[PDB]
DNA sequence: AGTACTTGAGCT
RNA sequence: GACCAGGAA
DNA sequence: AGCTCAAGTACTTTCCGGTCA
């Protein structure tokens, strides 16, 4: 569909980052974060992206 | 008055089981909500839906 | 828990 | 709160 | 090399103790 889904868009170049309510930090007491699994996976993605970016 | 029937009647070992009702009974109408889903939390203990 | 489809790999 | 494990009409 | 299959896969309920940042 030329408007809503072109094939090129099956490929990712820009990664939408979901906001905290999707990946909320379940924060026991106060001096202890407790971030959500997705927040980590994104962190990884971010990191992995920076290695590649500086590497080239 | 006498019962018209005769009854089977005697000792029989019975056991008190760990399921007691005031440990079971539960009610809720507005109350603690999950964080992720914002739906009611689970379990009598936690005061769930 | 047995059947589903679908994947997979090996043989002639 | 994830996750694992065990036990009930 | 390709092409056939058997043998490979994941997938198909209401209640009420541990370890993990």
UniProtKB/Swiss-Prot annotation, chain A:
Signal peptide: none annotated. Residues 24-36 are annotated as: Lid loop. It is found in: Nucleus. The tandem 7 residues repeats in the C-terminal domain (CTD) can be highly phosphorylated. The phosphorylation activates Pol II. Phosphorylation occurs mainly at residues 'Ser-2' and 'Ser-5' of the heptapeptide repeat. The phosphorylated form of Pol II appears to carry, on average, one phosphate per repeat. The phosphorylation state is believed to result from the balanced action of site-specific CTD kinases and phosphatases, and a 'CTD code' that specifies the position of Pol II within the transcription cycle has been proposed. Disulfide bonds: none annotated. It comes from the Eukaryota. Component of the RNA polymerase II (Pol II) complex consisting of 12 subunits. Interacts with DEF1; the interaction is direct and serves to bridge RPB1 to the Elongin complex in a DNA-damaged dependent manner. Interacts with the Elongin subunit ELA1. Interacts with the Elongin subunit ELC1. Interacts with ASK10. Interacts with ESS1. Interacts with RTT103. Interacts with SHE2. Mutagenesis experiments demonstrate that the minimum viable CTD contains eight consensus Y-S-P-T-S-P-[A-S-N-G] heptapeptide repeats. Identical and simultaneous substitutions in a number of consecutive repeats are lethal: 'Ser-2' -> 'Ala-2' (14 repeats), 'Ser-5' -> 'Ala-5' (15 repeats), '2-Ser-Pro-Thr-Ser-5'-> '2-Ala-Pro-Thr-Ala-5' (10 repeats), 'Ser-2'-> 'Glu-2' (15 repeats), 'Ser-5' -> 'Glu-5' (12 repeats), '2-Ser-Pro-3' -> '2-Pro-Ser-3' (15 repeats) and 'Tyr-1' -> 'Phe-1' (12 repeats). DNA-dependent RNA polymerase catalyzes the transcription of DNA into RNA using the four ribonucleoside triphosphates as substrates. Largest and catalytic component of RNA polymerase II which synthesizes mRNA precursors and many functional non-coding RNAs. Forms the polymerase active center together with the second largest subunit. Pol II is the central component of the basal RNA polymerase II transcription machinery. During a transcription cycle, Pol II, general transcription factors and the Mediator complex assemble as the preinitiation complex (PIC) at the promoter. Belongs to the RNA polymerase beta' chain family. The C-terminal domain (CTD) serves as a platform for assembly of factors that regulate transcription initiation, elongation, termination and mRNA processing. This is DNA-directed RNA polymerase II subunit RPB1. It comes from Saccharomyces cerevisiae (strain ATCC 204508 / S288c) (Baker's yeast). The chain holds residues 225 to 280 of 1733 of the full protein.
Swiss-Prot record, chain B:
Disulfide bonds: none annotated. It is found in: Nucleus. Belongs to the RNA polymerase beta chain family. The binding of ribonucleoside triphosphate to the RNA polymerase II transcribing complex probably involves a two-step mechanism. The initial binding seems to occur at the entry (E) site and involves a magnesium ion coordinated by three conserved aspartate residues of the two largest RNA Pol II subunits. Present with 18700 molecules/cell in log phase SD medium. DNA-dependent RNA polymerase catalyzes the transcription of DNA into RNA using the four ribonucleoside triphosphates as substrates. Second largest component of RNA polymerases II which synthesizes mRNA precursors and many functional non-coding RNAs. Proposed to contribute to the polymerase catalytic activity and forms the polymerase active center together with the largest subunit. Pol II is the central component of the basal RNA polymerase II transcription machinery. Component of the RNA polymerase II (Pol II) complex consisting of 12 subunits. This is DNA-directed RNA polymerase II subunit RPB2. It comes from Saccharomyces cerevisiae (strain ATCC 204508 / S288c). The gene is RPB2. The chain holds residues 1079 to 1127 of 1224 of the full protein.
């Amino acid at each position: 569909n030329e408007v809503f889904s072109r094939p090129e868009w099956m490929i990712l170049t820009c990664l939408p980052v979901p906001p905290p309510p999707v990946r909320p930090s379940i924060s026991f007491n106060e001096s202890q974060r407790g971030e959500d699994d997705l927040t980590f996976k994104l962190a990884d993605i971010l990191k992995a992206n920076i290695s590649l970016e500086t590497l080239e | 008055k006498k019962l018209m029937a005769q009854i089977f009647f005697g000792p029989t070992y019975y056991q008190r089981l760990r399921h007691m009702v005031d440990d079971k009974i539960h009610a809720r109408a507005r109350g603690p909500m999950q964080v992720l889903t914002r739906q009611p939390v689970e379990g009598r203990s936690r005061d769930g839906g």
